[PDB]
Design a protein around this ligand. Structure first.
Ligand SMILES: *[C@@H]1O[C@H](CO[C@H]2O[C@@H](C)[C@@H](O)[C@@H](O)[C@@H]2O)[C@@H](O[C@@H]2O[C@H](CO)[C@@H](O[C@@H]3O[C@H](CO[C@H]4O[C@@H](CO)[C@@H](O)[C@H](O)[C@@H]4O)[C@@H](O)[C@H](O)[C@@H]3O)[C@H](O)[C@H]2NC(C)=O)[C@H](O)[C@H]1NC(C)=O
Ligand code: PBZ
Ligand code: PBZ
Lengths: 260, 14
């Protein structure tokens, strides 16, 4: 995340740091973000798995504020580290268009919730695409500068405005590459935006208005990071509720949707 | 079953 601020410990307890584990030396590197749905499942981006497709390629890190690049040590209470049981990539995912950039990871053993770890909410079946105008938030340990050499050790957060898909898809913006299952967010002039390392993480808007946030988007792609008229392109979670329910059960979906 | 309950809540610590 470029141009944002350090998140407070506990600010986004559903954040998960998805880390590549280099098995030759037991080191781990934050690569992508994800959002915790329940003790056994988190939501993230399919494209994060294009190269590391094996459950053994990853460690999953929960309740973190800071993550340590390259560490070979396990985490400390209250953080939790878990293995991946299964990676479920949408059957219609296409890397060339980034269409249906969404996946599920099954966590093992099950995570335990508490002060720094907890599920996010998904949109209601009735919600539809998120509406402009709104000010929403993203979070993640992605690059702090387009050209950074490493992800950010401290979790970042930033407010970003939703951008209407027609504007986002227009001639001098993404000019045809935006799909109806996308959401775009950021600012016409850029300067604030998600970047590499934040993929898979949430785009969250505050219901209306409980005091609870909804993950309405999943960080997917952009051209560069923080460039003018090249905002963050996200996968709309609402577009995949049936798909998610089909992998984890309607009951698990209903449990993380706010009261009718 | 610690993960059931009210979704989307921040700062569960307080
Ligand atoms: C974003 O814009 C793009 C494209 O418009 C762009 O043109 C490009 C190349 C740039 O130069 C820019 O000028 C401009 O942004 C929209 O892309 C179009 O998407 C259409 C909807 O998917 C699609 O038409 C194709 O034809 C088939 C549709 O046919 C099926 O659907 C219905 C009708 O909806 C029936 O009528 C059909 O018989 C059948 O059931 C599909 O198979 C194809 O997927 C496709 O839909 C084109 O694919 C596409 N055209 C171009 C030029 O690429 C895009 O939708 C815009 N995004 C949004 C969210 O509106
Ligand atoms: N999912 C597990 N059975 C598992 C995953 C990775 C691993 N290194 C060991 C066990
Ligand atoms: N927000 C974007 N500019 C962006 C998002 C994800 C990503 N992997 C690269 C760029």
């Amino acid at each position: 995340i470029i141009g944002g601020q350090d998140a407070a410990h506990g600010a986004w307890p559903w954040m998960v740091s998805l880390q590549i584990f280099t098995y030759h030396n037991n080191r781990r590197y934050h690569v992508c973000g994800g959002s915790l749905l329940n003790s056994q499942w988190l939501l993230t981006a399919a494209h994060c798995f294009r190269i590391k497709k094996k459950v053994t390629d990853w460690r999953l890190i929960f309740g973190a504020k800071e993550v340590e690049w390259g560490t070979n040590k396990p985490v400390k209470p209250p953080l939790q580290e878990r293995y991946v049981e299964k990676i479920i990539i949408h059957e219609k995912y296409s890397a060339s268009s980034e269409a249906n950039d969404i996946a599920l990871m099954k966590i093992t053993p099950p995570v335990t919730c508490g002060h720094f770890i907890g599920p996010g909410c998904l949109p209601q079946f009735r919600a539809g695409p998120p509406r402009v105008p709104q000010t929403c938030w993203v979070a993640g340990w992605g690059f702090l500068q387009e050209n950074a050499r490493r992800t950010s050790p401290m979790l970042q957060e930033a407010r970003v405005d939703l951008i209407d898909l027609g504007l986002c898809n227009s001639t001098r913006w993404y000019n045809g590459r935006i799909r109806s299952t996308n959401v775009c967010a950021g600012y016409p002039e850029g300067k604030i935006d998600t970047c590499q390392g934040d993929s898979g993480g949430p785009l969250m808007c505050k219901d209306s208005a409980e005091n609870s946030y909804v993950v309405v988007g999943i960080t997917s792609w952009g051209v560069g990071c923080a460039r003018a008229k090249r905002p963050g392109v996200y996968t709309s979670t609402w577009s995949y509720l049936n798909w998610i329910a089909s992998k984890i059960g309607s009951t698990a979906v209903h449990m993380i949707q706010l009261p009718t | 079953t610690t993960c059931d309950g009210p979704c989307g809540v921040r700062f569960r610590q307080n």
